[PDB]
Coordinates of C-alpha atoms and ligand atoms in Angstrom, one line a residue:
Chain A
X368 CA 9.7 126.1 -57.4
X369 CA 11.5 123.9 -55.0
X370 CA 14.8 124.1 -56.4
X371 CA 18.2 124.5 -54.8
X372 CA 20.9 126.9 -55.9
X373 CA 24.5 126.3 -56.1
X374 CA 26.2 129.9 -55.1
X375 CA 29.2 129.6 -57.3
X376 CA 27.6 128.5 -60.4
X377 CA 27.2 131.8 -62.4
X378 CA 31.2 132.9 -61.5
X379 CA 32.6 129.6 -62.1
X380 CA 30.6 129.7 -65.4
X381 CA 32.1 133.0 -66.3
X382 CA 35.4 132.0 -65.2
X383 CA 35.1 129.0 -67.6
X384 CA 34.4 131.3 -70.8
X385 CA 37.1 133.5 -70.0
X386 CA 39.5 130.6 -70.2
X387 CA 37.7 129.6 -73.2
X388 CA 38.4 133.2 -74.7
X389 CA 42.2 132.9 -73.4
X390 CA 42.4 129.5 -75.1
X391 CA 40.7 131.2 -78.9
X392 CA 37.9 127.7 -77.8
X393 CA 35.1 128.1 -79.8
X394 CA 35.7 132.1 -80.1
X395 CA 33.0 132.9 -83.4
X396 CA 33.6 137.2 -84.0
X397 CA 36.8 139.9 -84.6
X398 CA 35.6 142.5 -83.4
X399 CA 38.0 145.4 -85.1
X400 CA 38.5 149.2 -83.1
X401 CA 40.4 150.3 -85.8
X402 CA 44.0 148.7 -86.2
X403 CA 43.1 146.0 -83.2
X404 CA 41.1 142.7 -83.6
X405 CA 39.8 141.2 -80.4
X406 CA 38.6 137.8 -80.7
X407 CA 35.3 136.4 -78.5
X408 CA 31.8 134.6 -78.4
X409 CA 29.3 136.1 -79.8
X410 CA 26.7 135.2 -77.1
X411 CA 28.6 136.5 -74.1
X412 CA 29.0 139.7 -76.5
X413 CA 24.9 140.1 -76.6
X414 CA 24.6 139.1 -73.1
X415 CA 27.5 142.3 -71.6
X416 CA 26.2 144.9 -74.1
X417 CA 22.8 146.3 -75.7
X418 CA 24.5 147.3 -78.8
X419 CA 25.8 143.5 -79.4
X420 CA 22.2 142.0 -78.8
X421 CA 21.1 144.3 -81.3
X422 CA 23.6 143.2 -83.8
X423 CA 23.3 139.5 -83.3
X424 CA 19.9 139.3 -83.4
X425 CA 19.9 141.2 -86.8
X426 CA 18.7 138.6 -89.3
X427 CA 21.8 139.7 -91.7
X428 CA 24.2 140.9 -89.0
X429 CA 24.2 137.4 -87.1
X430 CA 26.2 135.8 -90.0
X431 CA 28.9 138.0 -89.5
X432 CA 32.5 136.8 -88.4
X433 CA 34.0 140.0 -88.6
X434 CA 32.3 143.5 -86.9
X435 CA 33.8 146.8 -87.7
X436 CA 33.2 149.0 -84.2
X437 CA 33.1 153.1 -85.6
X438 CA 36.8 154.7 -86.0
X439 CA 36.2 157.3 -82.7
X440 CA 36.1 154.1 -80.4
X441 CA 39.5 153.7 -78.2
X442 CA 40.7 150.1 -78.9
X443 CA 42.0 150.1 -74.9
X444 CA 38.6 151.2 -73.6
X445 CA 36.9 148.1 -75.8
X446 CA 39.9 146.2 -74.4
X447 CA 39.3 147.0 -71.0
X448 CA 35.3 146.6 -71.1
X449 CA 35.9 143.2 -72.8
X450 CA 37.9 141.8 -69.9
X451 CA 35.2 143.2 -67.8
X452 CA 32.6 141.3 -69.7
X453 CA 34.4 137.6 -68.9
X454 CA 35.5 139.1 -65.5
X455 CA 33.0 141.1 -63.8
X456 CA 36.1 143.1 -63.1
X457 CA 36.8 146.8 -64.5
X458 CA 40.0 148.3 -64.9
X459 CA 39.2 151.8 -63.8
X460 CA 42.1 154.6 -64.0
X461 CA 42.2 158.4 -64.3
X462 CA 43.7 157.7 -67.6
X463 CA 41.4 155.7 -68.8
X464 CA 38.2 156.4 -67.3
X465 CA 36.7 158.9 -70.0
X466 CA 37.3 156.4 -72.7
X467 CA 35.8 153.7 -71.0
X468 CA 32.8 155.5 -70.3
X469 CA 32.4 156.7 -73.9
X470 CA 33.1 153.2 -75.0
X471 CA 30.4 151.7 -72.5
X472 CA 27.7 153.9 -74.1
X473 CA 28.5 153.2 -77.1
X474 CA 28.2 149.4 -76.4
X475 CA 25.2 150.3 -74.2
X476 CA 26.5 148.8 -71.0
X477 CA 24.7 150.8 -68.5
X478 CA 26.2 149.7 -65.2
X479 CA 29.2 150.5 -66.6
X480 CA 28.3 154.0 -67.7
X481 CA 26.7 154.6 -64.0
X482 CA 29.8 153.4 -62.0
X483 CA 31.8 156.1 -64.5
X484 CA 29.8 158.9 -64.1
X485 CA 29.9 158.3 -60.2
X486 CA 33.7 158.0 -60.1
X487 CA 33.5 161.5 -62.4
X488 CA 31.1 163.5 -60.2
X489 CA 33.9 162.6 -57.3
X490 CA 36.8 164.3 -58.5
X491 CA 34.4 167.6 -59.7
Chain B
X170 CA 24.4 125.1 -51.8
X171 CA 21.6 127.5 -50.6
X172 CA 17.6 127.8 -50.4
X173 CA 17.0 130.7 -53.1
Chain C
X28 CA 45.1 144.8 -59.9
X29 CA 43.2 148.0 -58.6
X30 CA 40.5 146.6 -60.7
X31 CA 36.4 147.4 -59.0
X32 CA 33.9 144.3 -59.4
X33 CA 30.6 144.7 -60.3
X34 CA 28.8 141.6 -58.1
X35 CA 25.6 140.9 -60.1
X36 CA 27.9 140.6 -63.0
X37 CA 28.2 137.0 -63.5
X38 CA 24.3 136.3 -62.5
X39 CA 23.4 139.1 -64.9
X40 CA 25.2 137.2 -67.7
X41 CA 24.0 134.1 -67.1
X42 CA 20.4 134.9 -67.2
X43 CA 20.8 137.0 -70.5
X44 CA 23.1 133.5 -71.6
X45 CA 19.3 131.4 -70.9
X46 CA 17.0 134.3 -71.9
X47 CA 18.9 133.8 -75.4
X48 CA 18.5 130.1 -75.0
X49 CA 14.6 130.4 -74.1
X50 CA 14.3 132.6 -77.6
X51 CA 16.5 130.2 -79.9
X52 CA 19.0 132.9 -80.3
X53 CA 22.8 131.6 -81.7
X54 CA 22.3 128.0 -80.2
X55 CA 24.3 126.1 -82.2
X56 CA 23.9 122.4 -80.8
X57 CA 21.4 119.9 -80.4
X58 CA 21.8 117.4 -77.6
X59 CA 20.0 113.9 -78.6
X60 CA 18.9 111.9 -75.4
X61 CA 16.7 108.9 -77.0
X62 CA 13.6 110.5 -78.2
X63 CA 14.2 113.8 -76.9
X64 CA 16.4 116.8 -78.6
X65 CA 17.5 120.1 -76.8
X66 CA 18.9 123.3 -78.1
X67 CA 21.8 124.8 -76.1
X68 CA 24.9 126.9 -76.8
X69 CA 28.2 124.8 -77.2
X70 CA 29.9 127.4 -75.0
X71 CA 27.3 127.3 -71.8
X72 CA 27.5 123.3 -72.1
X73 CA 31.5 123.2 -72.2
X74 CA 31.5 125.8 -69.0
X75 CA 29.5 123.6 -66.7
X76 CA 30.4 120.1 -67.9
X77 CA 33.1 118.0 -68.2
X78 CA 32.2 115.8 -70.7
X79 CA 31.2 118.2 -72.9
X80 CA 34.5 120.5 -72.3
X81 CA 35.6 116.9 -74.2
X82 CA 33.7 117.0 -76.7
X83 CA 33.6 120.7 -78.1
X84 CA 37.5 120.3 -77.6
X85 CA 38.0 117.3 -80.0
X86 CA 39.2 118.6 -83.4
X87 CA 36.5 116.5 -85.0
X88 CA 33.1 116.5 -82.2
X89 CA 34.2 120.7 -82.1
X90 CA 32.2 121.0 -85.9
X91 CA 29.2 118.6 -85.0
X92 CA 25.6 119.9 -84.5
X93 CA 24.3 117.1 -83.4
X94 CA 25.8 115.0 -80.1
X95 CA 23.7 111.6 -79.2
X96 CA 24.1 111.1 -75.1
X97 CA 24.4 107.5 -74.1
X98 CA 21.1 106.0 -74.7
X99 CA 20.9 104.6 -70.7
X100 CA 20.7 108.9 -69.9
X101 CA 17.1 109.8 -69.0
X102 CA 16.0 112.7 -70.9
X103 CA 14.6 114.6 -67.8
X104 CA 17.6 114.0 -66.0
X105 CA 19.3 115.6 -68.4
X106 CA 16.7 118.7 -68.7
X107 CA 16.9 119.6 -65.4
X108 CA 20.7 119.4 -65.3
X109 CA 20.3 121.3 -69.0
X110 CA 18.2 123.9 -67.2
X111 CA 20.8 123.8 -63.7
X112 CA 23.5 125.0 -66.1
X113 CA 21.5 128.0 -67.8
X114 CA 20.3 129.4 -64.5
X115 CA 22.3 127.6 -61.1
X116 CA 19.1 126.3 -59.6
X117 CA 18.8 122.5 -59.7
X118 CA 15.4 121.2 -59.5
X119 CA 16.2 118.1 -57.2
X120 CA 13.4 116.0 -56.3
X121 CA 13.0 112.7 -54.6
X122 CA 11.2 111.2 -57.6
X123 CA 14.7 112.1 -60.3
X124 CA 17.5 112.5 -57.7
X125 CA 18.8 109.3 -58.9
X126 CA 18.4 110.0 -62.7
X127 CA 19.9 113.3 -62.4
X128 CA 23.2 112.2 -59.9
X129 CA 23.7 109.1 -62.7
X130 CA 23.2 112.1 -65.1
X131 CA 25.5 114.7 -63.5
X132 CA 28.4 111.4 -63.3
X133 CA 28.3 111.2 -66.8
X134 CA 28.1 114.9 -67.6
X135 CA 30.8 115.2 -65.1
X136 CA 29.3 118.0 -63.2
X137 CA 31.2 117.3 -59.6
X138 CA 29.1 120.1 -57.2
X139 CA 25.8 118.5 -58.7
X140 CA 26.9 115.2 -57.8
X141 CA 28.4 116.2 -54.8
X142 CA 24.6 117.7 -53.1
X143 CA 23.1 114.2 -54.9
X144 CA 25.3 112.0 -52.7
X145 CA 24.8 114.6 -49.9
X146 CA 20.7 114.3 -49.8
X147 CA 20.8 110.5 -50.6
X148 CA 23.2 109.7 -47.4
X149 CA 20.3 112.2 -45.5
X150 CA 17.7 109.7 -46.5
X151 CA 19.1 106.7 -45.9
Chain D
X1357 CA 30.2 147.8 -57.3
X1358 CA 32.6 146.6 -54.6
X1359 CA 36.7 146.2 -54.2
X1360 CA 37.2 142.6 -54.9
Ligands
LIG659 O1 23.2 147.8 -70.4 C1 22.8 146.8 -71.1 C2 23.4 145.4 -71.0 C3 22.5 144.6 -72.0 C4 22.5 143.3 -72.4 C5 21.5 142.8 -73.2 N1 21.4 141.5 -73.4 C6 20.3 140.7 -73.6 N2 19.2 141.2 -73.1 C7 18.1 140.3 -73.1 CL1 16.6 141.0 -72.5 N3 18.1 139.0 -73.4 C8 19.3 138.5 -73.8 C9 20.4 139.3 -73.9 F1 21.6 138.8 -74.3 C10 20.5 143.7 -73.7 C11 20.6 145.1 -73.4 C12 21.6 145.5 -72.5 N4 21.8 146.8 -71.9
LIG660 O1 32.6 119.2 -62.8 C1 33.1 119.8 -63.8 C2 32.6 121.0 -64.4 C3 33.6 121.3 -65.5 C4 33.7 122.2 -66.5 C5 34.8 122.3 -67.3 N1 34.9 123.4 -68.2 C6 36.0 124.1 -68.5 N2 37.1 123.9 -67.8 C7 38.2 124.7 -68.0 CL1 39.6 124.4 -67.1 N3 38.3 125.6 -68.9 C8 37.1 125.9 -69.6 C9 36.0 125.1 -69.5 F1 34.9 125.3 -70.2 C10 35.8 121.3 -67.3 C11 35.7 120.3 -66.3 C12 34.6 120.3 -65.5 N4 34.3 119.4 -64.4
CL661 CL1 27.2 146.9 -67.7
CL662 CL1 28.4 121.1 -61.2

Protein backbone atom coordinates (compact mmCIF):
# COMPACT_ATOMS: atom_id res chain seq x y z
CA UNK A 1 0.00 0.00 0.00
CA UNK A 2 0.69 3.68 0.18
CA UNK A 3 0.54 4.12 3.79
CA UNK A 4 2.68 6.03 6.18
CA UNK A 5 4.00 4.79 9.54
CA UNK A 6 4.22 6.56 12.71
CA UNK A 7 7.62 5.15 14.37
CA UNK A 8 6.49 5.35 17.92
CA UNK A 9 3.18 3.86 17.60
CA UNK A 10 3.76 0.22 18.74
CA UNK A 11 6.04 1.51 22.11
CA UNK A 12 3.76 4.18 22.94
CA UNK A 13 0.99 1.43 22.63
CA UNK A 14 2.78 -0.85 24.94
CA UNK A 15 3.67 1.85 27.17
CA UNK A 16 -0.07 2.66 27.42
CA UNK A 17 -1.10 -1.05 28.52
CA UNK A 18 1.49 -1.16 31.05
CA UNK A 19 0.00 1.83 32.68
CA UNK A 20 -3.23 0.21 32.24
CA UNK A 21 -1.81 -2.94 34.08
CA UNK A 22 -0.28 -0.54 36.89
CA UNK A 23 -3.68 1.20 37.22
CA UNK A 24 -5.65 -2.80 37.58
CA UNK A 25 -7.76 -0.81 34.02
CA UNK A 26 -9.59 -3.29 32.41
CA UNK A 27 -7.06 -6.18 33.84
CA UNK A 28 -9.49 -9.58 32.95
CA UNK A 29 -7.05 -12.89 34.49
CA UNK A 30 -5.03 -13.88 38.06
CA UNK A 31 -2.66 -15.69 36.95
CA UNK A 32 -1.56 -17.71 40.32
CA UNK A 33 2.53 -19.21 40.60
CA UNK A 34 1.72 -20.73 43.64
CA UNK A 35 1.11 -18.36 46.67
CA UNK A 36 1.34 -15.10 44.10
CA UNK A 37 -1.54 -13.65 41.97
CA UNK A 38 -0.43 -11.41 39.15
CA UNK A 39 -3.13 -9.52 37.62
CA UNK A 40 -3.18 -8.61 33.48
CA UNK A 41 -4.98 -8.66 30.00
CA UNK A 42 -5.58 -11.58 28.69
CA UNK A 43 -4.76 -10.44 25.05
CA UNK A 44 -1.35 -9.05 25.70
CA UNK A 45 -0.93 -12.51 27.62
CA UNK A 46 -1.63 -14.52 24.17
CA UNK A 47 0.27 -12.03 22.20
CA UNK A 48 4.02 -12.34 24.75
CA UNK A 49 3.59 -16.19 25.05
CA UNK A 50 2.57 -19.47 22.99
CA UNK A 51 1.37 -21.17 26.00
CA UNK A 52 -1.28 -18.17 26.77
CA UNK A 53 -2.56 -18.20 22.97
CA UNK A 54 -3.07 -21.75 23.48
CA UNK A 55 -5.08 -21.21 26.61
CA UNK A 56 -7.23 -18.32 25.45
CA UNK A 57 -8.13 -19.67 22.47
CA UNK A 58 -9.37 -22.93 24.15
CA UNK A 59 -13.18 -22.78 23.71
CA UNK A 60 -13.55 -23.63 27.67
CA UNK A 61 -10.22 -22.09 28.90
CA UNK A 62 -11.15 -18.51 27.46
CA UNK A 63 -13.89 -18.09 30.23
CA UNK A 64 -11.52 -18.31 32.79
CA UNK A 65 -10.68 -15.46 35.25
CA UNK A 66 -8.38 -17.27 37.28
CA UNK A 67 -5.30 -19.61 35.71
CA UNK A 68 -3.46 -21.89 37.89
CA UNK A 69 0.44 -21.91 36.34
CA UNK A 70 2.02 -25.70 37.51
CA UNK A 71 3.66 -25.54 41.28
CA UNK A 72 7.61 -25.92 39.79
CA UNK A 73 7.12 -22.39 38.14
CA UNK A 74 9.19 -19.51 40.24
CA UNK A 75 6.61 -16.83 40.92
CA UNK A 76 9.83 -14.05 40.40
CA UNK A 77 10.73 -15.57 37.08
CA UNK A 78 6.78 -15.16 35.94
CA UNK A 79 7.22 -11.80 37.66
CA UNK A 80 10.05 -10.76 35.75
CA UNK A 81 8.88 -12.19 32.24
CA UNK A 82 5.49 -10.30 32.88
CA UNK A 83 7.20 -6.92 33.20
CA UNK A 84 9.02 -7.91 30.16
CA UNK A 85 5.86 -8.62 28.25
CA UNK A 86 4.42 -4.71 28.90
CA UNK A 87 8.12 -3.51 28.70
CA UNK A 88 10.10 -5.12 26.15
CA UNK A 89 12.58 -4.95 28.92
CA UNK A 90 14.10 -8.10 30.84
CA UNK A 91 15.49 -8.19 34.14
CA UNK A 92 18.39 -10.49 33.56
CA UNK A 93 20.71 -11.51 36.75
CA UNK A 94 22.95 -14.36 37.59
CA UNK A 95 20.42 -15.10 40.18
CA UNK A 96 17.80 -15.13 38.27
CA UNK A 97 18.62 -16.15 34.99
CA UNK A 98 18.03 -20.04 35.21
CA UNK A 99 14.51 -19.46 36.43
CA UNK A 100 13.66 -17.10 33.93
CA UNK A 101 14.73 -19.27 31.27
CA UNK A 102 12.75 -22.27 32.60
CA UNK A 103 9.88 -20.05 33.13
CA UNK A 104 10.11 -18.70 29.37
CA UNK A 105 9.86 -22.25 28.01
CA UNK A 106 7.38 -22.98 29.91
CA UNK A 107 5.30 -19.98 28.66
CA UNK A 108 6.87 -20.62 25.15
CA UNK A 109 8.44 -17.26 24.72
CA UNK A 110 11.15 -18.14 22.44
CA UNK A 111 13.23 -14.89 22.18
CA UNK A 112 13.35 -15.05 25.62
CA UNK A 113 14.63 -18.58 25.91
CA UNK A 114 17.42 -17.72 22.97
CA UNK A 115 18.74 -14.48 24.66
CA UNK A 116 19.16 -16.99 28.01
CA UNK A 117 20.74 -19.65 26.56
CA UNK A 118 23.25 -17.01 24.92
CA UNK A 119 23.92 -15.26 28.24
CA UNK A 120 24.52 -19.15 29.58
CA UNK A 121 26.88 -20.42 26.93
CA UNK A 122 29.04 -17.04 27.94
CA UNK A 123 29.84 -17.78 31.42
CA UNK A 124 30.67 -21.80 30.32
CA UNK B 1 6.56 9.75 10.61
CA UNK B 2 8.35 7.52 8.00
CA UNK B 3 7.89 5.78 4.41
CA UNK B 4 7.67 1.96 5.50
CA UNK C 1 17.92 -0.78 35.86
CA UNK C 2 20.63 -3.24 34.22
CA UNK C 3 17.55 -4.43 32.46
CA UNK C 4 18.40 -5.76 28.20
CA UNK C 5 15.56 -4.73 25.62
CA UNK C 6 14.40 -6.82 23.12
CA UNK C 7 13.68 -4.09 20.08
CA UNK C 8 11.12 -5.89 17.95
CA UNK C 9 9.29 -6.35 21.21
CA UNK C 10 6.60 -3.87 21.01
CA UNK C 11 6.04 -4.30 16.91
CA UNK C 12 5.98 -8.06 17.72
CA UNK C 13 3.02 -7.44 20.08
CA UNK C 14 1.21 -5.30 18.22
CA UNK C 15 0.91 -7.45 15.19
CA UNK C 16 -0.08 -10.66 17.40
CA UNK C 17 -2.68 -7.74 19.27
CA UNK C 18 -4.28 -7.30 15.18
CA UNK C 19 -3.62 -10.92 14.09
CA UNK C 20 -6.06 -11.65 17.20
CA UNK C 21 -8.34 -8.87 16.01
CA UNK C 22 -8.31 -10.13 12.19
CA UNK C 23 -9.52 -13.83 13.81
CA UNK C 24 -12.26 -12.38 16.30
CA UNK C 25 -10.29 -13.63 19.15
CA UNK C 26 -11.36 -11.89 22.91
CA UNK C 27 -12.61 -8.59 21.22
CA UNK C 28 -14.86 -7.48 23.49
CA UNK C 29 -16.45 -4.13 21.88
CA UNK C 30 -18.26 -3.13 19.00
CA UNK C 31 -17.80 0.37 17.82
CA UNK C 32 -21.24 1.75 15.98
CA UNK C 33 -20.39 4.49 13.27
CA UNK C 34 -24.01 4.93 11.49
CA UNK C 35 -24.50 1.85 9.48
CA UNK C 36 -21.27 0.37 10.03
CA UNK C 37 -20.03 -1.87 13.26
CA UNK C 38 -16.42 -2.90 14.07
CA UNK C 39 -14.92 -5.39 16.41
CA UNK C 40 -11.90 -4.20 18.41
CA UNK C 41 -10.34 -4.89 21.84
CA UNK C 42 -11.36 -2.27 24.58
CA UNK C 43 -7.61 -2.24 25.67
CA UNK C 44 -5.96 -1.49 22.00
CA UNK C 45 -8.69 1.33 21.56
CA UNK C 46 -7.98 3.00 25.16
CA UNK C 47 -4.00 2.83 24.25
CA UNK C 48 -4.16 4.80 21.09
CA UNK C 49 -7.11 7.13 21.83
CA UNK C 50 -8.13 9.67 23.98
CA UNK C 51 -11.52 9.52 23.86
CA UNK C 52 -11.78 6.16 24.27
CA UNK C 53 -9.15 6.11 27.40
CA UNK C 54 -12.64 8.23 28.52
CA UNK C 55 -14.85 5.99 27.93
CA UNK C 56 -13.45 2.54 29.07
CA UNK C 57 -12.49 4.59 32.20
CA UNK C 58 -16.07 5.75 33.18
CA UNK C 59 -17.49 3.39 35.91
CA UNK C 60 -20.58 3.00 33.79
CA UNK C 61 -19.32 3.19 29.57
CA UNK C 62 -16.24 0.57 31.23
CA UNK C 63 -19.20 -2.50 31.18
CA UNK C 64 -20.83 -1.46 27.70
CA UNK C 65 -20.35 -3.68 24.52
CA UNK C 66 -21.61 -1.48 22.41
CA UNK C 67 -20.32 2.50 21.90
CA UNK C 68 -22.29 4.58 19.06
CA UNK C 69 -19.57 7.30 17.60
CA UNK C 70 -21.18 10.65 16.83
CA UNK C 71 -23.24 10.12 13.87
CA UNK C 72 -21.29 13.20 11.76
CA UNK C 73 -18.02 10.39 12.01
CA UNK C 74 -17.46 8.75 8.61
CA UNK C 75 -17.25 5.18 8.97
CA UNK C 76 -14.02 4.88 6.73
CA UNK C 77 -12.44 7.53 8.53
CA UNK C 78 -12.81 5.71 11.38
CA UNK C 79 -11.53 2.20 9.74
CA UNK C 80 -8.50 3.45 8.65
CA UNK C 81 -7.80 5.15 11.91
CA UNK C 82 -9.29 1.57 13.48
CA UNK C 83 -6.77 -0.18 11.28
CA UNK C 84 -3.71 2.84 12.18
CA UNK C 85 -4.11 1.66 15.80
CA UNK C 86 -3.81 -2.25 15.28
CA UNK C 87 -0.80 -1.93 13.00
CA UNK C 88 0.97 2.03 13.05
CA UNK C 89 0.51 2.43 9.34
CA UNK C 90 -2.10 5.15 8.40
CA UNK C 91 -3.53 4.77 5.13
CA UNK C 92 -3.73 8.70 4.29
CA UNK C 93 -5.01 9.59 1.03
CA UNK C 94 -6.05 12.74 -0.62
CA UNK C 95 -9.53 11.55 -1.16
CA UNK C 96 -10.19 10.82 3.26
CA UNK C 97 -7.42 13.09 4.65
CA UNK C 98 -10.17 15.29 5.77
CA UNK C 99 -12.49 12.60 7.15
CA UNK C 100 -9.78 10.87 8.95
CA UNK C 101 -8.03 14.37 10.60
CA UNK C 102 -11.94 15.35 11.74
CA UNK C 103 -11.84 11.69 12.74
CA UNK C 104 -8.49 11.52 14.68
CA UNK C 105 -9.87 15.30 16.51
CA UNK C 106 -12.56 13.47 17.91
CA UNK C 107 -10.80 10.26 18.73
CA UNK C 108 -8.16 12.45 20.14
CA UNK C 109 -5.27 10.78 18.50
CA UNK C 110 -2.71 14.05 18.53
CA UNK C 111 0.35 12.42 16.18
CA UNK C 112 -2.50 11.48 13.55
CA UNK C 113 -3.76 14.79 13.52
CA UNK C 114 -0.54 16.34 13.82
CA UNK C 115 0.83 14.59 10.02
CA UNK C 116 -3.13 15.54 8.76
CA UNK C 117 -2.43 19.24 9.41
CA UNK C 118 1.16 18.67 8.26
CA UNK C 119 0.17 17.27 4.50
CA UNK C 120 -2.87 19.68 4.26
CA UNK C 121 -0.57 22.99 4.87
CA UNK C 122 1.85 20.96 1.95
CA UNK C 123 -1.06 21.29 -0.43
CA UNK C 124 -2.26 24.34 0.08
CA UNK D 1 18.63 -7.66 22.04
CA UNK D 2 20.33 -4.28 22.88
CA UNK D 3 21.19 -2.22 26.25
CA UNK D 4 18.45 0.29 26.35
O1 LIG E 1 7.51 -17.53 21.39
C1 LIG E 1 6.33 -17.31 21.13
C2 LIG E 1 5.57 -16.02 21.37
C3 LIG E 1 4.19 -16.34 20.86
C4 LIG E 1 3.04 -15.58 20.78
C5 LIG E 1 1.93 -16.09 20.12
N1 LIG E 1 0.84 -15.23 19.92
C6 LIG E 1 -0.01 -15.17 18.89
N2 LIG E 1 0.38 -15.76 17.75
C7 LIG E 1 -0.36 -15.52 16.69
CL1 LIG E 1 0.16 -16.32 15.23
N3 LIG E 1 -1.44 -14.77 16.56
C8 LIG E 1 -1.79 -14.13 17.70
C9 LIG E 1 -1.10 -14.30 18.87
F1 LIG E 1 -1.50 -13.68 19.99
C10 LIG E 1 1.93 -17.42 19.67
C11 LIG E 1 3.06 -18.21 19.80
C12 LIG E 1 4.20 -17.65 20.39
N4 LIG E 1 5.47 -18.20 20.58
O1 LIG F 1 -3.52 11.49 21.48
C1 LIG F 1 -3.74 10.73 22.42
C2 LIG F 1 -3.54 9.23 22.46
C3 LIG F 1 -3.97 8.86 23.84
C4 LIG F 1 -4.01 7.65 24.51
C5 LIG F 1 -4.31 7.62 25.86
N1 LIG F 1 -4.18 6.39 26.53
C6 LIG F 1 -3.80 6.16 27.79
N2 LIG F 1 -3.14 7.15 28.42
C7 LIG F 1 -2.59 6.83 29.58
CL1 LIG F 1 -1.77 8.14 30.37
N3 LIG F 1 -2.56 5.68 30.21
C8 LIG F 1 -3.17 4.68 29.55
C9 LIG F 1 -3.78 4.87 28.33
F1 LIG F 1 -4.42 3.86 27.72
C10 LIG F 1 -4.73 8.79 26.52
C11 LIG F 1 -4.75 10.01 25.84
C12 LIG F 1 -4.35 10.03 24.51
N4 LIG F 1 -4.23 11.11 23.64
CL1 LIG G 1 9.84 -13.78 23.63
CL1 LIG H 1 -2.01 9.21 17.35
Amino acid sequence: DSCIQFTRHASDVLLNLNRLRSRDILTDVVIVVSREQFRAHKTVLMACSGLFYSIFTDQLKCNLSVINLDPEINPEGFCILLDFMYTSRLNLREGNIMAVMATAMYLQMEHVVDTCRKFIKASE
Amino acid sequence: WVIP
